[PDB]
A = this chain, B = another copy of it.
Amino acid sequence: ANDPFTIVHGNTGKCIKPVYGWIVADDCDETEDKLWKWVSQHRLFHLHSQKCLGLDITVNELRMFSCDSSAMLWWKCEHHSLYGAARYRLALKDGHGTAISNASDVWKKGGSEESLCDQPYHEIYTRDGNSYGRPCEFPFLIDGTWHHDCILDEHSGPWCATTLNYEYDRKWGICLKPENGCEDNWEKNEQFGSCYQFNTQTALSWKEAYVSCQNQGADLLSINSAAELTYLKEKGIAKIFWIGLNQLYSARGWEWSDHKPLNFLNWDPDRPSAPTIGGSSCARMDAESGLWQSFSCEAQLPYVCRKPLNNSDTRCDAGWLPNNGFCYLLVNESNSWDKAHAKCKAFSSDLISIHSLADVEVVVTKLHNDIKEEVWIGLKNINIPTLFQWSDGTEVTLTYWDENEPNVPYNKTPNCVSYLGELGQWKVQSCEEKLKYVCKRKGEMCPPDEGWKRHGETCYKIYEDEVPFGTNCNLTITSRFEQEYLNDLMKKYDKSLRKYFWTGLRDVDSCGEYNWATAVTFSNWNFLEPASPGGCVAMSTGKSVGKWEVKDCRSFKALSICKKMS
């Protein structure tokens, strides 16, 4: 997976390499005798020796082995250290490699300071061939040579073995590596400005497909317009394939994996927004009927991939509450959407349009302290296939759907959404319902780039270095709306797991009391958390995005998010 590296010793500055199978120190120069790689099952692979670093406990011995050996061949980094079987640490005595317990040695990659496993092992999934898209198995034996990477022939292109034994089995696939150009594996489309990849004879789970497109630099297929929906349904392009539409990795509701706005829809009524089989949270496209069906996120299906062709407060009238360049007025006289829209046209305005989470925050906290009551929103659909559009023509940037939303019914021509709940999230409604409504009309600093993004009257920033707790700063999460913005931010940053972020919640002492560094009004613990006292609290993305998990204050490191002007 990805670049080879050299293993520099911290205390000496020498690079380790095997001679006759035994580890020795050497001058750190980038010749082919010092390059190390990561191969599957957490194995360290010396490229030139074609052998893998391992221990023999059957006291013990540290040397190179044939990479398919039964010896202990796995290695994990523990805070610059590198331990193996029974946490024996890789160390260097008199310039000779030896593994011993409690060793206080330091190792780091050559040319940087990051640990050996700082870069995660990236799977390289295949297409075509006989392997049905199963990922590359590194390394694999071909008549004497251990291959850690794809092979060039002309086999149609770069190819790899997909099982731990190529002498038997004989299963292989064409390597899908990240590209800059949009050919070989991709197909250009000037009409949409995005390259598509139709993995048709493959069979991957939705998470596996999303990882396959992540590692290719692309994203899972999102369909934003009717022109795209009518497309693909022609052409083999697979009979049924995955699409980025998922409920798994969002905080409630459905979304596109690339966080494009979810406003063009085409639910199969048999497998709709509210899934028939409970807990099936990942949708697929049927290239025959054209419909999108909710489905079990673990089913093995073909998949499509796409990537782009990269080229102050105000004042209003009395009663109207202000927010940035706009002002909102809530109407308690419950009315249909047509009557509310017309009545707000009479107020020389229109039904509210929402584009940021700040808009939701103000239209939940500045207007109320109802909550249970649904409130009308300008967003509406009139066409089949579904296309939600704002009443005031503004572009659809935000779609803040609740769980199992948007639940657009079959063939019903008018579909009119509203907001409910503590978070003000949206759900589709029959347009004749009589609800309250909110209407918008016009009214009347952080440091420069880079990395700062302003939410409301607070400036947020992502510190991108996997650093221990309390370094840089301590973020305080005051409300669930702040939590939601943090969720959107983390989601927009990292893909998908692998990267945690730091809260400011910490238990000094061990009494079991978690507090910020100077009132714990808001709490967002994950499943079975805290689970232990005296910890430092972190959060991540993916499923349970933003949920608080406890971490070791000593060893665990994560990224930082921090705010000013608060």
Residues of A near any B CB (own CB < 8 A): 41-42, 57-60, 70, 72, 74, 76, 85-88, 101, 130-132, 134, 162-163, 169, 171, 203, 205, 274, 276-280, 296, 298-300, 507, 510-514, 520-521, 523, 525, 527-533
Shortest Cβ-Cβ A-B pairs, 10 listed:
A86-B512, A298-B298, A86-B533, A86-B530, A134-B278, A132-B277, A101-B512, A296-B300, A203-B277, A74-B528
Residue in chain B with minimal CB distance to A511: B101
Inter-subunit contact A278/B162 (CB<8 Å): yes
Residue A525 contacts which of B42, B72, B298 (CB distance < 8 angstroms)? B72
Inter-subunit contact A76/B300 (CB<8 Å): no
Across-interface contacts of A280 in B (CB, < 8 A): 300
Cα(A523)–Cα(B60), bound, Å: 14
Residue in chain B with minimal CB distance to A532: B87
> Separation in Å of the A71 CB from the closest CB of chain B?
9
With A87-B532, A299-B299 already in contact, the answer to whether A59 and B131 are too (CB < 8 A) is: no
Residue A279 contacts which of B134, B507, B529 (CB distance < 8 angstroms)? B134
Residue A507 contacts which of B41, B86, B298, B513 (CB distance < 8 angstroms)? B86
18 A-B pairs, CB-CB below 8 angstroms?
A57-B513, A57-B514, A58-B521, A59-B513, A60-B512, A70-B523, A76-B528, A85-B529, A86-B512, A86-B533, A87-B532, A88-B512, A131-B278, A132-B276, A134-B277, A134-B278, A296-B298, A299-B299
Cα(A279)–Cα(B74), bound, Å: 22
> Separation in Å of the A283 CB from the closest CB of chain B?
15
Given A57-B520, A60-B512, A205-B298, 6 other A-B residues pairs in contact with their CB atoms under 8 A: A59-B513, A72-B525, A87-B532, A101-B511, A132-B276, A134-B277
> Separation in Å of the A348 CB from the closest CB of chain B?
39
Inter-subunit contact A171/B278 (CB<8 Å): yes
Across-interface contacts of A514 in B (CB, < 8 A): 57, 86
Residue in chain B with minimal CB distance to A513: B59
Inter-subunit contact A533/B163 (CB<8 Å): no
Cα(A86)–Cα(B531), bound, Å: 5
Chain B CB count within 10 A is highest, among A57, A86, A162, A299, for: A86
With A101-B512, A278-B171 already in contact, the answer to whether A86 and B532 are too (CB < 8 A) is: yes
> Separation in Å of the A361 CB from the closest CB of chain B?
20
Across-interface contacts of A131 in B (CB, < 8 A): 277-278
> Separation in Å of the A209 CB from the closest CB of chain B?
14
With A58-B523, A74-B528, A513-B59 already in contact, the answer to whether A163 and B86 are too (CB < 8 A) is: no
Across-interface contacts of A296 in B (CB, < 8 A): 298-300
Across-interface contacts of A171 in B (CB, < 8 A): 278
> Separation in Å of the A126 CB from the closest CB of chain B?
10
> Separation in Å of the A385 CB from the closest CB of chain B?
26
Inter-subunit contact B57/A523 (CB<8 Å): yes
Across-interface contacts of A101 in B (CB, < 8 A): 510-512, 533
> Separation in Å of the A179 CB from the closest CB of chain B?
25
Inter-subunit contact A163/B278 (CB<8 Å): yes
Across-interface contacts of A59 in B (CB, < 8 A): 513
Inter-subunit contact A531/B87 (CB<8 Å): yes
Residue in chain B with minimal CB distance to A521: B58
Cα(A298)–Cα(B511), bound, Å: 42
> Separation in Å of the A205 CB from the closest CB of chain B?
8
Inter-subunit contact A42/B300 (CB<8 Å): no
Cα(A60)–Cα(B514), bound, Å: 11
Across-interface contacts of A525 in B (CB, < 8 A): 72, 85
Residue A42 contacts which of B57, B278, B528 (CB distance < 8 angstroms)? B528
Cα(A390)–Cα(B169), bound, Å: 29
Cα(A456)–Cα(B328), bound, Å: 85
Cα(A306)–Cα(B527), bound, Å: 36
Across-interface contacts of A523 in B (CB, < 8 A): 57-58, 70
Cα(A72)–Cα(B85), bound, Å: 37
Cα(A532)–Cα(B101), bound, Å: 10
Across-interface contacts of A300 in B (CB, < 8 A): 277, 280, 296, 299
Across-interface contacts of A162 in B (CB, < 8 A): 278
Across-interface contacts of A88 in B (CB, < 8 A): 512, 533
Cα(A243)–Cα(B552), bound, Å: 44
Cα(A278)–Cα(B130), bound, Å: 10
> Separation in Å of the A369 CB from the closest CB of chain B?
18
Residue A512 contacts which of B87, B205, B533 (CB distance < 8 angstroms)? B87
Residue in chain B with minimal CB distance to A205: B298
Cα(A86)–Cα(B525), bound, Å: 11
Cα(A279)–Cα(B531), bound, Å: 34
Cα(A422)–Cα(B72), bound, Å: 20
Residue in chain B with minimal CB distance to A524: B70
Cα(A87)–Cα(B298), bound, Å: 34
Across-interface contacts of A130 in B (CB, < 8 A): 276
